[PDB]
Design an enzyme around this catalytic site. Structure first.
Site, PDB file in Angstrom:
ATOM      1  CD  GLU A  25       7.887  -0.878  -2.449  1.00 14.82           C
ATOM      2  OE1 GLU A  25       7.985  -2.090  -2.163  1.00 14.82           O
ATOM      3  OE2 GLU A  25       6.807  -0.252  -2.377  1.00 14.82           O
ATOM      4  CG  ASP A  26       7.178   2.556   0.458  1.00 10.57           C
ATOM      5  OD1 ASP A  26       7.378   1.510  -0.196  1.00 10.57           O
ATOM      6  OD2 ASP A  26       6.707   2.553   1.615  1.00 10.57           O
ATOM      7  NE  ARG A  82      -2.348  -1.434   3.508  1.00  8.90           N
ATOM      8  CZ  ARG A  82      -2.855  -1.393   4.735  1.00  8.90           C
ATOM      9  NH1 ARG A  82      -4.021  -0.798   4.954  1.00  8.90           N
ATOM     10  NH2 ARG A  82      -2.196  -1.942   5.746  1.00  8.90           N
ATOM     11  N   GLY A  83       1.902   1.279   0.797  1.00  6.82           N
ATOM     12  CA  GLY A  83       2.664   2.487   1.060  1.00  6.82           C
ATOM     13  C   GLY A  83       3.383   3.149  -0.102  1.00  6.82           C
ATOM     14  N   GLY A 108      16.028  -5.627  -0.212  1.00 10.71           N
ATOM     15  CA  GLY A 108      15.963  -5.939  -1.626  1.00 10.71           C
ATOM     16  C   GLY A 108      15.245  -7.240  -1.915  1.00 10.71           C
ATOM     17  CG  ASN A 109      14.624 -10.420   1.013  1.00  8.90           C
ATOM     18  OD1 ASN A 109      15.806 -10.202   0.753  1.00  8.90           O
ATOM     19  ND2 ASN A 109      14.242 -11.348   1.882  1.00  8.90           N
ATOM     20  CB  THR A 110       9.623  -6.928  -1.647  1.00  5.02           C
ATOM     21  OG1 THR A 110      10.304  -5.676  -1.495  1.00  5.02           O
ATOM     22  CG2 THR A 110       9.209  -7.444  -0.277  1.00  5.02           C
ATOM     23  CG  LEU A 111      11.988  -3.304  -5.208  1.00 12.04           C
ATOM     24  CD1 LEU A 111      11.174  -3.149  -6.483  1.00 12.04           C
ATOM     25  CD2 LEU A 111      11.098  -3.158  -3.990  1.00 12.04           C
ATOM     26  CG  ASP A 132      14.912  -2.269   3.643  1.00 14.47           C
ATOM     27  OD1 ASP A 132      14.050  -2.316   2.742  1.00 14.47           O
ATOM     28  OD2 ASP A 132      14.709  -2.680   4.804  1.00 14.47           O
TER      29      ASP A 132
HETATM   30  N1  LIG Z   1       6.932   0.190   7.539  1.00 21.31           N
HETATM   31  C1  LIG Z   1       8.302   0.255   7.361  1.00 21.31           C
HETATM   32  N2  LIG Z   1       8.986   1.279   7.882  1.00 21.31           N
HETATM   33  C2  LIG Z   1      10.318   1.374   7.728  1.00 21.31           C
HETATM   34  O1  LIG Z   1      11.015   2.445   8.278  1.00 21.31           O
HETATM   35  C3  LIG Z   1      11.018   0.367   6.997  1.00 21.31           C
HETATM   36  N3  LIG Z   1      12.313   0.133   6.646  1.00 21.31           N
HETATM   37  C4  LIG Z   1      12.351  -1.009   5.936  1.00 21.31           C
HETATM   38  N4  LIG Z   1      11.127  -1.518   5.814  1.00 21.31           N
HETATM   39  C5  LIG Z   1      10.802  -2.756   5.106  1.00 21.31           C
HETATM   40  C6  LIG Z   1       9.373  -2.719   4.456  1.00 21.31           C
HETATM   41  N5  LIG Z   1       9.461  -2.785   2.947  1.00 21.31           N
HETATM   42  C7  LIG Z   1       8.134  -3.047   2.397  1.00 21.31           C
HETATM   43  C8  LIG Z   1       7.686  -1.884   1.475  1.00 21.31           C
HETATM   44  O2  LIG Z   1       6.504  -2.278   0.782  1.00 21.31           O
HETATM   45  C9  LIG Z   1       5.339  -1.506   1.104  1.00 21.31           C
HETATM   46  C10 LIG Z   1       4.738  -2.043   2.427  1.00 21.31           C
HETATM   47  P1  LIG Z   1       4.500  -0.720   3.652  1.00 21.31           P
HETATM   48  O3  LIG Z   1       5.795   0.014   3.857  1.00 21.31           O
HETATM   49  O4  LIG Z   1       4.043  -1.323   4.969  1.00 21.31           O
HETATM   50  O5  LIG Z   1       3.450   0.243   3.160  1.00 21.31           O
HETATM   51  C11 LIG Z   1      10.372  -3.860   2.552  1.00 21.31           C
HETATM   52  C12 LIG Z   1      11.407  -3.347   1.553  1.00 21.31           C
HETATM   53  P2  LIG Z   1      12.595  -4.622   1.107  1.00 21.31           P
HETATM   54  O6  LIG Z   1      11.944  -5.627   0.206  1.00 21.31           O
HETATM   55  O7  LIG Z   1      13.770  -4.002   0.387  1.00 21.31           O
HETATM   56  O8  LIG Z   1      13.082  -5.308   2.372  1.00 21.31           O
HETATM   57  C13 LIG Z   1      10.248  -0.689   6.467  1.00 21.31           C
HETATM   58  N6  LIG Z   1       8.905  -0.702   6.674  1.00 21.31           N
END
Ligand SMILES: Nc1nc(=O)c2ncn(CCN(CCOCCP(=O)(O)O)CCP(=O)(O)O)c2[nH]1
Ligand SMILES: Nc1nc(=O)c2ncn(CCN(CCOCCP(=O)(O)O)CCP(=O)(O)O)c2[nH]1
Ligand SMILES: Nc1nc(=O)c2ncn(CCN(CCOCCP(=O)(O)O)CCP(=O)(O)O)c2[nH]1
Ligand SMILES: Nc1nc(=O)c2ncn(CCN(CCOCCP(=O)(O)O)CCP(=O)(O)O)c2[nH]1
Ligand SMILES: [Mg+2]
Ligand SMILES: [Mg+2]
EC number: 2.4.2.8
Lengths: 172, 170, 172, 170
Positions: free
Chosen positions: D93-94, D42-43, D99-102, D97
């Site tokens: 994407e927002d 969502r974010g 890099g798993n999801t991407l 870090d």
């Molecule tokens: N909610 C939140 N706040 C943070 O400060 C943060 N840092 C890393 N992440 C990991 C979440 N992030 C998920 C981002 O997708 C959108 C889901 P939303 O952030 O809950 O809206 C994983 C990125 P990755 O695949 O590179 O590990 C954070 N999530």
């Protein structure tokens, strides 16, 4: 077919309207002793939601739901809400209400989950094509029977990224 | 830790479903309208497969997956593929007890305004009833025993068993 | 349009075939030191899955997945798997392979999740219409280019509940 | 327990996105093929809303929702509504870090065989990188601080903030 998009509602007019809309939603749910959640209807509501919730000065949640639309079909749920709405201030965020058919069923589905309050906020409104009496608590603009685009609303999946509401004129 | 013994053998299941097939057949005979069986995934896929083969009425087979403080979610992960408006709809489920899921599911489907809306369940635990929900066709009425097999699982296991078994813990 | 369904594969023939199919899947994964899962493709695979897994005498799991089909569209996932398949014996259960287009992409998607083993079991097979070379480890029946129904397979959403495979003959 | 202070003010976000809009515009200028921005719900709904309004190229706006031992699920709860085959696809994407999801998302979308496939992220934490995934457009490079706002949440909260803030714990 050959068409032309003409500016109907400028970017400045929308920003001011949303500013007031959020300045209408805030004092509504200002002292409600319960959690609040805005429910946007994908796909063409992402832009409205993003700008509206930034004007809603009330600590709330933001969720989404993709529903098929009545038109005479059944309203099915392609993507349901992530979080729950039981006992919460639910505000359905829609981009356009012409028939009210889809939104009426969406409200009925969410109402089954028994929220504390349930309301609807729309950006555009076509009362000209209203087929089902459905109560709308917040309306941005009441518009003519013009096929509009921009600000999330599409035409053959186009013009969604436009910062303004435009009308489509077929070259004839 | 566990072991599994047979409660309702494969043969007994087939006999009951055969009887269920005749009951449903006469109820929707000479109805005229279209008919559709809606299964609640996952643990109703096997029951549906055997039940619809006993229903000798031209019907459709649709599916739906629902999610589970009072009724935390009951969201719709996978909605039906076809419309049910103006049709005879029979909800096919494996287990009914608390009546939570079936109650909301019946409510959701009722909004699509079908001609009729009934429920057919394989198993039934009347003791855990929190919500009084109308059920027309019941395969087996069982006491509050934790069962598996025939689509019903325990930590994603025993779904493929051709019989209904009980889980004893050691 | 006006048609007639004629019995192509009787109920007895299918039951015997599935009996042998399950008596081919069992000794394949009999000593695999890993969890097993059967993945059925909705909607017309529910009957095949139910009968097959009852002949698979190996402790496994049963999951489902609804995918859109190539045909030239993109294969999208309408309903994904509930459980995970990483490091598991995954056996894709399909009712019919004519083009192989859909199944090829389905296998590619699941392969990204990195399972230990990945195979495909189909009930019916139309090599006559094969457009994409896709390895099928288990085949129930290889059939002509006949529009079949029954046992999950539909025609205008009909005949799914038939215990036998039938052919459709247009009245001309 | 918590409080929230501003890290990247609303004004600074708009300025960066404006710059991002120009970069993406020139990259896909005179490309000829269709273009589509895919947001990861969502974010990323807010970032998408402001970014696509800065991209002055006729493109489409699609969405997708993914799920989260090594990479437990990465299932597709909500797939795209439109095809991407033979199109220029930019993933929006927002936060990036680990890099798993991407990584997986790019893999899944690659199977649909688009003309091009790039990634645009609002925030980036290079320190947590477990999987080296190519990212072309980065809004802000930040240290390993837990941030909220602008779509990013903390226990379903602060998604509606027009700025990027930090969560301090008491
Ligand atoms: N909610 C939140 N706040 C943070 O400060 C943060 N840092 C890393 N992440 C990991 C979440 N992030 C998920 C981002 O997708 C959108 C889901 P939303 O952030 O809950 O809206 C994983 C990125 P990755 O695949 O590179 O590990 C954070 N999530
Ligand atoms: N592109 C476009 N331009 C229009 O001027 C228009 N009017 C109605 N519609 C679609 C009818 N539709 C209006 C909202 O649906 C639009 C789909 P979305 O943009 O993905 O949210 C009926 C829903 P309702 O029963 O609650 O009012 C339009 N679409
Ligand atoms: N797995 C399992 N084994 C049981 O013996 C059992 N008894 C009740 N339940 C409750 C599960 N049941 C869910 C049945 O939906 C299919 C999910 P599946 O059983 O995991 O395949 C709730 C019925 P309710 O709405 O009347 O409370 C059981 N579940
Ligand atoms: N009703 C019907 N009768 C047929 O004889 C037939 N042949 C192919 N198809 C559909 C083509 N389709 C075959 C399987 O899709 C059927 C949809 P399902 O029954 O819901 O699983 C191509 C998938 P593939 O690329 O993996 O082979 C048929 N449908
Ligand atoms: Mg809408
Ligand atoms: Mg199939």
């Amino acid at each position: 077919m050959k068409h032309t998009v003409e500016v109907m509602i400028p970017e400045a007019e929308i920003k001011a309207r949303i500013a007031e809309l959020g300045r209408q939603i805030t004092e509504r749910y200002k002292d409600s002793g319960s959690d609040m959640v805005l429910v946007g209807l994908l796909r063409g509501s992402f832009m409205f939601m993003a700008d509206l919730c930034r004007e809603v000065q009330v600590s709330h949640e933001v969720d989404f739901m993709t529903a098929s639309s009545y038109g005479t079909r059944d309203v099915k749920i392609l993507k349901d809400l992530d979080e729950d709405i039981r006992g919460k201030d639910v505000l359905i965020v829609e981009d356009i209400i012409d028939s009210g058919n889809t939104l009426s069923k969406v409200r009925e589905i969410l109402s089954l989950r028994e929220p504390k309050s349930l309301a609807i906020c729309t950006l555009l409104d076509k009362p000209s094509r209203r087929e089902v009496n459905v109560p709308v608590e917040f309306i941005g603009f009441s518009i003519p029977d013009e096929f509009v685009v921009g600000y999330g609303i599409d035409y053959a999946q186009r013009y969604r990224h436009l910062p303004y509401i435009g009308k489509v004129i077929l070259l004839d």
